[PDB]
Structure 1
Amino acid sequence: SMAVKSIKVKLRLDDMPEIRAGLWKLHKEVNAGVRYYTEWLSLLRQENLYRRSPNGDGEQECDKTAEECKAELLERLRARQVENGHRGPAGSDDELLQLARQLYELLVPQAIGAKGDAQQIARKFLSPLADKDAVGGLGIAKAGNKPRWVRMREAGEWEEEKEKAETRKSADRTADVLRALADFGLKPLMRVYTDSEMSSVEWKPLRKGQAVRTWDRDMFQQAIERMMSWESWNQRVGQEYAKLVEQKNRFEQKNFVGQEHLVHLVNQLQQDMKEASPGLESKEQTAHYVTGRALRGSDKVFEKWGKLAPDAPFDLYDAEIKNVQRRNTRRFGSHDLFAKLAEPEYQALWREDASFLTRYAVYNSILRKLNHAKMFATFTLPDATAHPIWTRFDKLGGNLHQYTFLFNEFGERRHAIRFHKLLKVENGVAREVDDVTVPISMSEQLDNLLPRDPNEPIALYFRDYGAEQHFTGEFGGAKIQCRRDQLAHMHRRRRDVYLNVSVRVQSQSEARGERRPPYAAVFRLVGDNHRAFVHFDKLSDYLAEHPDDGKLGSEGLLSGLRVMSVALGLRTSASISVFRVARKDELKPNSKGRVPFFFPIKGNDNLVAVHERSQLLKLPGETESKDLRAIREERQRTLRQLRTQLAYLRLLVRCGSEDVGRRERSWAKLIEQPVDAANHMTPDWREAFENELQKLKSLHGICSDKEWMDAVYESVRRVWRHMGKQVRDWRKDVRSGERPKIRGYAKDVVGGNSIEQIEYLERQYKFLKSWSFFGKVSGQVIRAEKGSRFAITLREHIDHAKEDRLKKLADRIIMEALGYVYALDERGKGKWVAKYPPCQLILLAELSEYQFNNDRPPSENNQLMQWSHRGVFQELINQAQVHDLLVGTMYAAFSSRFDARTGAPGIRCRRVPARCTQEHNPEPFPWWLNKFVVEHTLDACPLRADDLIPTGEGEIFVSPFSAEEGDFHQIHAALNAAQNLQQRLWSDFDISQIRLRCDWGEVDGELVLIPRLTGKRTADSYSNKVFYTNTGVTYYERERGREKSVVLMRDPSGIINRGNWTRQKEFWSMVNQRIEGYLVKQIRS
């Protein structure tokens, strides 16, 4: 309900090692206590425990079976009866096992599917289970917080709330289980950890009537928490595994019921390639099974195969596969699969049903995921070093061991933390102490915290650049943390210790006592994806109640109604456009009186959405220039040299193979061509590689096998030991190298927080991994060892690089939404200024389904991980909670392929750079300019500057503007996609207005396309309608309601095919003809 934030603080423990040792001892004690109670709960559960399987990661073993638990549980219960001196009934084994299971389901209600409060369960049971004289859980004690009906009776009147206490107390089996434990001599079931032989700490003596310390209550709660969440996963994993088995059986008899002979044929196929595979021996059940990844682009190959003869030779089938791969090498599948599918014995898989293999690929993915799906969640006890939990500290006034944050205890910014209870270790003995004041290391992050009330040392103020008034906040719970790397170690040194303080920050809306900001009732956010929908009924009154008054920054959220759409990307991290809800009674802009761009709003005809500003929120390093382009090439010069040198080293190693026909085909690739025509290698190493080749050329065929192979391996050592020194010097220049470093603020940097700089680091890790695992023996596999770590310092740097990019991206988006701009003065040199009124809503693209998938090529998956847009989406929701900013998503299908102003479909294009058209020393063409010139054969055509090149992936969106051939509307692709999200917000857009999936069928005697009713919007418009044709390309609607489905497209602007419903294939070829076909024809002249 309230924004919580963690500020990690470091403790200066240099001048007091007796307290540093006490904190470490306290950390070991709390982990040992949690492990004691967690182990007790696992025995009361008396079910199977599963652990991580060694000697192979994947499956899971049975660490402790149920009979082992029940046997060990009974050993403790019987020994406890003896320890309590029980003289009454001992109870049978089955009675004690049922009582223990009952108690477990009260401690962890998630075991049976119920809900449980970890705070209140641990408070309710620790004393009744560990205090010898406890009366809690029963109905005897008069203490405790008054019930909810007693609070109403005294103020706020009662009748129904006193009934709910009784009917809930009737179904409360706590009193009977505790009395059943008492009758069996188990009145103290477990032991208080601090008051037992397990702890060697000399704790403060127990008070009268005290048996449990505050430390034990911290331990017992953390044991219930980890137990509850794990039990919730046991139920969740079991359910999701059961749904998989149902998915498998509900799929065979619902997809290919009458297609049984094809299933037997593809099984022969999957085992045909299984035997004829020269790769590694198969071990998985689904090995060589037909997957969707291997069938990538099979739709194009099958249509091109249908236009052939079944008895035709291979090459015409094979060259028809090569053409599909050449069209785009990235979105292509397996050549060998299509090579075997062209064989006449397997042609029936794609000839009869052209969609069978993709259906069966889904069935194979269900088979593989079912073979790896777990049935139970692994159970791992806490460990002080391996799997640590952290000792908690309640705030001042809490019920646990508390702490105060001391502002300026030793200086201007020298803060301190006073632990009211702690441990102190002097000459090996651990001793509990009181009132320990510990200074804090300097933290500029702590400068955002200011004390609020002297009488209450919990209140604070919270600073923020995007808030003119500081937020009111309180200190919360804290936890003592140590570094994970300084944890498994022991040594004999005096280990940094941190305190992780939770800060609860109150937003400006929450400070006024409102559940939600007043503009929250205008925007409906649905689901976890925060799908945004506008209450068009209510925004006419909101503008009357909240008129624009010009207040900037965080002071203008209650005046006006603005929305900022964001288009995330890789070249530019964020592209934004701001719109304002205003009456159509407007006027001309300040500059040159050009009517402002606006969108109509559904429902309200008096109100529109006026465009305010559009910007590219480029993180540092996302710029480009002549000098920047050169430095970025030089920073990877030696790296790209060593990468290609390694590729030719492996070619030389294959020449030393024991397989005649491998070394001969490999030795052919070395002597047939020159070594480095592209000059990608270093000069000196290339010369050494040429010497060994010409040396082996004077021995090939002349010498014997075991004498030639011996020379090949000796020439590999000389060249590998040579390149080894090159890799050594390269790394020396990477860590210790003296490259220029920025001072102060500066735009146009080398890498900064750009995707390229992170991949510049990733490229170094990929090569070093390839360099260390490079094998000098041909055919040997070298993988990492079962627990090794590689490039620890570089890997942590790449992760810290992505973490810093993610947080700075979300902050830029929010600072812009709030209306703040970081501007330079050179007399102040950069300062956040409130320049614009704020936006109450940040509109993102709904991309929850754009996840990593095996169907996508591994490159496209790699980009999605570099991008990590879902991480940007979650970081925005976190940082926006304090600023009362709403973050919502919009249906993003075809957001970048349709015009935001016109509505006509378009093509992403690039413009020719002037480096390639200047007559004085022209630079070579890029990759996209070459592919475009090759497709249309424009070698003798002179390109000009800023020539549009339709590539389908550029940063410039081009759409036809009218029937005039060449009349184009050009705009930034990311900003067009950003404005499209805005246009869809105010019009209540649905994909059914542009795209429709249909199936053939009979309705009124003629063959027509029946549209698929997906969602209530599609059913509201096209349920009673149907589409007919005369040519098969342009469809028209009626009013009555092959085997594959047909997708219909529509131009809302009426420019392409007069906005009639068109088949998807011909529709986009018409868009291509009016853009690509025109630009190509004009270039030819």
Structure 2
Amino acid sequence: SMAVKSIKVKLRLDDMPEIRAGLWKLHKEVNAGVRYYTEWLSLLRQENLYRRSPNGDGEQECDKTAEECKAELLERLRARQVENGHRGPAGSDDELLQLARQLYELLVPQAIGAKGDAQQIARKFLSPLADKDAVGGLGIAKAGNKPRWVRMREAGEWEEEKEKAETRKSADRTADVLRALADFGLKPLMRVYTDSEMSSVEWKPLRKGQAVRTWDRDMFQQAIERMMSWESWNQRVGQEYAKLVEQKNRFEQKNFVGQEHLVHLVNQLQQDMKEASPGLESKEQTAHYVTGRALRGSDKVFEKWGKLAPDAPFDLYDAEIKNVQRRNTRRFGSHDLFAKLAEPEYQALWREDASFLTRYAVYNSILRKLNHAKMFATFTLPDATAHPIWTRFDKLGGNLHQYTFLFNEFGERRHAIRFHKLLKVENGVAREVDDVTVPISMSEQLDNLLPRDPNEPIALYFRDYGAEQHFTGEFGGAKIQCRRDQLAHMHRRRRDVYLNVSVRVQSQSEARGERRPPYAAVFRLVGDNHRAFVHFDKLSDYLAEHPDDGKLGSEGLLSGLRVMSVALGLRTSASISVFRVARKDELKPNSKGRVPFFFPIKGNDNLVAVHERSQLLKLPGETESKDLRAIREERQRTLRQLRTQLAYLRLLVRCGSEDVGRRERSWAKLIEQPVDAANHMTPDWREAFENELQKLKSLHGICSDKEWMDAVYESVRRVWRHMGKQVRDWRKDVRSGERPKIRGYAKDVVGGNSIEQIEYLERQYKFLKSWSFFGKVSGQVIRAEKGSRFAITLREHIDHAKEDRLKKLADRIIMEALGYVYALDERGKGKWVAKYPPCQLILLAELSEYQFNNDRPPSENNQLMQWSHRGVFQELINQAQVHDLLVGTMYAAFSSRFDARTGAPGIRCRRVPARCTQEHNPEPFPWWLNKFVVEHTLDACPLRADDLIPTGEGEIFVSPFSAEEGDFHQIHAALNAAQNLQQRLWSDFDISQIRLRCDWGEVDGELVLIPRLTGKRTADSYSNKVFYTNTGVTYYERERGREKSVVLMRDPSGIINRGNWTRQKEFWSMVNQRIEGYLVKQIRS
């Protein structure tokens, strides 16, 4: 309910090693304490425990079975009765096992599916289960916090709340489980860890009537927490495994009931390629099964196959596959699958049902995910070094061992932390101490914390560049952490120790005693994706209650109503456009009296959404210039050289194969062509590679196999030893190299926080992995070992690079929504200034369904992981909680393919750079300009500067503006998608207004398209309607309500096909003809 933030602080422990060894001893103690109580809970659970399987990661093994638990649990229970000196009844083995099971389901209610408070369960049971003289859990104790109804009865009156105490105390088996534990001699069930033989720490002597320390209560709660979440996963894994078995069986008899003979044929196919595969021997059950990845683009190949003869030769079937792949190499599947599907014995899989193979691929994916799906969540005990938990410290006033944050205890910015209880180690003995003050290393992050109240040293202020007034906050719990790498080590050194302090920060809305900000009642955020919906009823009165008064920054959140839409991307990290709700009684702007761009708002006819500003929120490094383009090519020069050199080394290794017909085919590829017509290799290594080739040419055929193969391997060593020194010097210049480094703030940097610079790092890791695992023997597989790490320092930099990009992206989006802009003065050299009124809502694109999938090509999944938009979406919700900013998503289908201003569909285009048209020193054409010149054969046509090139993926969106041939409307593709989200907000957009899915059928005697009713909006408009045709392309609605489905598209601007309902294929070709068809013809003249 309140924004929590963690500021990790480092302890200066150089001058006091006895406390450093005490903090490390305390860490092993708490980890041992939690492990003791968690192990106890596992025995009370008396069910199977599963661990990670060694000798092969994937499946899981049974670490401890149920009988192993009950036997070990009874061994503890019987021994405890002896220790307690029980003279009464000892109870049957079945009685004790059931009693222990009853207690476990009270300790971890999630075992049976209930909810549980880890705080209160640990407080309620630790003493009654380990204190010899405990009276808690029963109804005897008079102490404790007063019930709800007592607080009501004294002030705030009661009747129903006193009832709820009894009727809940009725269903509380705690009192009886405790008395049953008492009658069996198990009154102390477990031991107090600090007061047992397990800890060698000389703890402070126990007070009278004390048996549990604050350290034990910390250990017990953290044992309940991990045991709760794990049980919640045991239930979740078993549930999701059950729905998988139901999915497998609900599918066979719901998709291909009458298509049983095709199922037997694809099974023959999947074992056909299984035997005839030259790859490694299969081991998986679903090996060589038909997957959706292998069928990528099968729709294009099948339609082109239907126009053929079943007895026709292969080459006309195969060359029709090559044409589909050439259309886009990225979105194509397996050539061998389509090659075997063209064989006449297998043609029935795609001839009868052209959608059966994709249907059966889904069945195979359910098969594979079921063979790997786990049935139980693995169980791992905490460990001081392997799976560490951290010693918590309550804030000042808390119930655990507390701490104070001492502002400026030793200097201007020299802060300190006083642990009221701690451990100290002097000459090997651990001793509990009181009131240890520990200074903190300098942290510029701590400069955002100011003390608020001297009498309450928990209070603080919180600074922020996007808040004119500082927030009020409180210190919270803290935890003592060490690094993970300094953890598995021991050595004999005096290991950095950190305190992770939790800071609770109160937002300006929360400071006014309001559950939600006043503008939250205007925007309905639904679901985990925060799908935004506008309450059009209420915004007519909100503007009356919250008029725009010009207050900037965080001070203007309660005045006006503004929404900022954000279009995330790779080239530009974010593209924004701000709109303002205002009456249509407006005027002309300050620049040159141009009627401002606005959108109509549904419901209110007096109010519109006026566009305020649009901006490209480029993170540093996402710019481009002549010198920047040169440096980025030079920074990867020697890398791209070594990458192509290694590729030819492998071609040389294959020549030493033991397979005649492999080395011969490999030796052919080496001598048939010149070595490096593209000049991608280095000069000297290529001269060495040419010396070896001409040496083997004077031996090929002349010599014998075991004498030619011996020379090929010896030649590999020289070239490998040679290129080895090259890789050595390249890395030397990478780490120690002296490259120019920016000082101060500066725009137009080489990499910065861009995707390219992270991939520049990723490219180095990918090559080094390919260089170390390079094999000198042809045919051998070289993988990493079962516990190895590779390029540890480089990998951590790559992750830190993405982590820094992610946080700076979210802050940039947030600082812009609030109306702050980082501007330069050169007398101040950069400072955040409030320039605009803030936006109350950040509208993103609904991209939760844009996930990594095996159906997507690996290059597309890779970009999705470099992008990681869902990570950006979660970091936005994190940083926005303090500023009272709402973040929501908008349905984003076709957001980049339709005009935001006009509504007409369009195509993403690029413009020809002037580097390729200048007569003085022109630069070569890029990849996209080549693919376009080739498709339409424009080799002899002179391109001009800023010529539009329709590529389907550029940064310039182009749409037909009217029926005039050549009349276009051009705008930034990202900003066009951002404004499209805004247009869809104020109009309550639904996809049924532009696209519809239908199926054929009879209604009034004729064949018509019956639209699929998806969502209440589609049912509200098209349930009672149906679509007819006279030509099969353009459909018209009626009023009465093949085998594949038909998707109809619609131009809301009426420019393309008069805005009638058009079949999807021909619709986008009309879009293509009116844009691409025009641009090609004007170029040809």
TM-score, length-normalised on structure 1?
1.00
Measure, in 2, the Cα distance between the counterparts of 1:111 and 1:1022.
48
Q: In structure 1, what is the equivalent of residue 735 of structure 2? A: 735
1:1042 equivalent in structure 2: 1042
- Give 1:705 deviation, angstroms: 0.2
CA shift for structure 1 position 749: 0.1
Q: 1:1029 deviation in Å? A: 0.2
Rounded Cα–Cα distance in structure 2 between residues aligned with 1:832 and 1:788: 46
- Alpha-carbon deviations, 1:509-563, whole Å to 9, x = none? 0000000000000000000000000000000000000000000000000000000
1:730 CA drift (Å)? 0.0
Shift of 1:794: 0.1
Is 1:516–2:516 an aligned residue pair?
A: yes
- Partner Cα separation in structure 2 for residue 90 and residue 545 of structure 1: 73
How much has 1:814 moved relative to structure 2? 0.2
2-structure distance, mates of 1:939, 1:921: 19
Q: CA deviation at 1:447?
A: 0.1
Q: Deviations over 1:267-319 (max 9, x none)?
A: 00000000000000000000000000000000000000000000000000000
Structure 1 residue runs of 4 or more that deviate by more than 2 Å after TM superposition: none
Q: Say whether residues 1:495 and 2:524 are aligned partners.
A: no
Deviations 1:130-160 (A, max 9, x none): 0000000000000000000000000000000
Per-residue deviation, residues 704-728 of structure 1 (Å, max 9, x unmatched): 0000000000000000000000000
Q: CA deviation at 1:400?
A: 0.1
Shift of 1:71: 0.3
2:924 and 2:509 map into 1 onto residues whose CA distance is 57
**Partner of 1:142: helix, strand, or coil?**
coil
- Report SS of the residue matched to 2:410: coil
What displacement does 1:634 show? Answer: 0.2
Give 3-state SS (helix, strand or coil) of 1:1001's partner. Answer: strand
Instruction: State the alpha-carbon separation in 2 of the partners of residues 415 and 963 from structure 1.
Output: 71
Cα distance, 1:690 vs structure 2: 0.1
- Once the two structures are TM-superposed, the CA of residue 774 in structure 1 deviates from its matched residue by 0.2
Instruction: String of CA shifts for 1:996-1023, please: whole Å, max 9, x gaps.
Output: 0000000000000000000000000000
- Measure how far apart 1:231 and its partner are: 0.0
| Structure 2 residue aligned with 1:145 | 145
State how far apart, in whole Å, the 1-side matches of 2:73 and 2:312 are.
74
Instruction: Provide the rounded CA distance (Å) in 2 between the counterparts of 1:876 and 1:1024.
Output: 42
| 1:1075 Cα offset (Å) | 0.1
Partner of 2:316: 316
Aligned equivalents of 1:481 and 1:538: distance in 2? Answer: 49
1:625 to partner: Cα distance:
0.1
1:786-821 alpha-carbon deviations (Å, 9 max, x no partner): 000000000000000000000000000000000000
> How far is 1:1058 from its partner?
0.2
The aligned residue for residue 714 of structure 1 is 714
In 2, Cα distance between equivalents of 1:136 and 1:515:
36
> Secondary structure, in 3 states, of the residue corresponding to 1:194?
helix
Does residue 64 (structure 1) correspond to residue 72 (structure 2)? The answer is: no
Separation in 1, partners of 2:150, 2:729: 78
Shift of residue 661 of structure 1? 0.1
| Cα shift at 1:837 | 0.1
Deviation at 1:593, TM superposition (A): 0.1
How far apart are 1:587 and its partner, in Å? 0.1
Residues in 1 aligned to 2:435 and 2:181: alpha-carbon distance in whole angstroms: 40
Q: Report the alpha carbon displacement of residue 578 of structure 1 after superposing the two structures with TM.
A: 0.1
Question: SS at 1:12's partner residue?
Answer: coil
1:824 aligned partner: 824
Question: Residues 137-192 of structure 1, C-alpha deviation per residue, up to 9 Å, x if partnerless?
Answer: 00000000000000000000000000000000000000000000000000000000
Residues of 2 paired with 1:373 and 1:560: CA distance? 52
Post-superposition Cα deviations, 1:189-221, rounded to whole Å, max 9, x if no partner, equal 000000000000000000000000000000000
Q: What is the distance in 2 between the residues matched to 1:45 and 1:827? A: 68
Match of 1:766 in 2: 766
Question: What are the superposed Cα offsets for residues 610-658 of structure 1, whole Å, 9 maximum, x if unpaired?
Answer: 0000000000000000000000000000000000000000000000000
The CA distance in 2 between the partners of 1:575 and 1:637, in whole Å, is 32
Q: What's the CA shift for 1:249?
A: 0.3
Give, in whole Å, the separation in 1 of the partners of 2:755 and 2:316.
43
Superposed displacement of residue 927, structure 1: 0.1
**CA shift for structure 1 position 405:** 0.1
**Aligned sequence identity (%):** 100
Give the C-alpha shift of residue 357 in structure 1: 0.1
Distance across 2 between alignment mates of 1:657 and 1:963 = 65
| Whole-angstrom distance in 1 between the partners of 2:94 and 2:822 | 71
CA distance in 2, matches of 1:89, 1:577: 77
Superposed CA offset, 1:923-974 (max 9, x none): 0000000000000000000000000000000000000000100000000000
- Structure 2 residue aligned with 1:995: 995
The offset of 1:79, in angstroms, is 0.2
Instruction: Give the alignment's TM-score, normalised by structure 2.
Output: 1.00
Q: 1:859-882, CA deviations, whole angstroms, 9 ceiling, x for partnerless residues?
A: 000000000000000000000000
* Rounded Cα–Cα distance in structure 2 between residues aligned with 1:431 and 1:82: 32
Once residues 744 and 539 of structure 1 are traced to their aligned partners in structure 2, the CA distance between those partners, rounded to angstroms, is 45
Any idea what SS the aligned residue of 1:641 has?
helix
Instruction: List gaps (5 residues or longer) in structure 2.
Output: none
- TM-fit CA distance, 1:669: 0.1
SS at match of 1:378: coil
Residue deviations 1:13-54 (CA, integer Å, cap 9, x gap): 000000000000000000000000000000000000000000
1:384-419 residue CA offsets vs partner (Å, 9 max, x unmatched) = 000000000000000000000000000000000000
Aligned-pair distance for 1:104? Answer: 0.1
**Residues 467-497 of structure 1: CA deviation (Å, up to 9, x unaligned):** 0000000000000000000000000000000
Alpha-carbon distance in 2 for matches of 1:590, 1:568: 30
In the TM superposition, residue 898 of structure 1 has moved relative to its aligned partner by 0.1
What is the CA–CA distance in structure 2 between the aligned matches of 1:5 and 1:940, rounded to whole Å?
Answer: 63
SS in 1 for 2:616: strand
Deviation at residue 89 of structure 1 after TM alignment = 0.1
SS at match of 1:608: strand
Q: Secondary structure of the residue that 1:966 maps to in structure 2?
A: coil
Q: For 1:375 and 1:849, locate their aligned partners in 2 and report how far apart those are by CA, in whole Å.
A: 26
Q: Which residue of 1 aligns with 2:86?
A: 86
Deviation at residue 442 of structure 1 after TM alignment: 0.1
C-alpha displacement of 1:1064: 0.1
Compute the RMSD of aligned alpha carbons: 0.1
| Inter-partner Cα distance in structure 1 for 2:722 and 2:1040 | 79
1:831 offset after TM fit, Å? Answer: 0.1
Q: Secondary structure at the match of 2:69?
A: helix
1:515, 1:77 → 2: CA distance? Answer: 50
Tell me by how many angstroms 1:505 deviates: 0.1
Task: Please state whether the residue corresponding to 1:627 is helix, strand or coil.
Answer: helix
Per the TM alignment, residue 685 of structure 1 is displaced from its structure 2 partner at its CA by 0.0
Cα distance per residue 1:895-919 (max 9 Å; x no partner): 0000000000000000000000000
Give the distance between the partners of 1:424 and 1:292, measured in 2 at CA.
62
Partner secondary structure for residue 152 of structure 1: helix
CA distance in 1, matches of 2:823, 2:203: 57
Instruction: Give, in whole Å, the separation in 2 of the partners of 1:280 and 1:95.
Output: 56
What CA distance in whole angstroms lies between the structure 1 residues aligned with 2:692 and 2:963? 66
Query: What's the offset of the Cα at 1:94?
Result: 0.2
Cα offset, 1:242, TM superposition = 0.0
Question: What secondary structure is seen at the aligned counterpart in 1 of 2:1081?
Answer: helix
Q: Deviations over 1:64-90 (max 9, x none)?
A: 000000000000000000000000001
Q: Distance in 1 between matches of 2:784 and 2:828?
A: 52
CA distance in 1, matches of 2:622, 2:679: 30
How far apart, CA to CA, are the structure 2 residues paired with 1:620 and 1:1034? 48
1:291 aligns with 2:265: no
Deviations 1:216-257, CA, capped at 9 Å, x for gaps = 000000000000000000000000000000000000000000
Say which SS state the counterpart of residue 194 (structure 2) adopts. coil
For structure 1, which runs of at least 5 residues remain unmatched after alignment? none
Query: How big is the shift at 1:436?
Result: 0.2
Q: Deviations over 1:430-458 (max 9, x none)?
A: 00000000000000000000000000000
Shift of 1:841: 0.1
Structure 1 distance, partners of 2:611, 2:623, is: 26
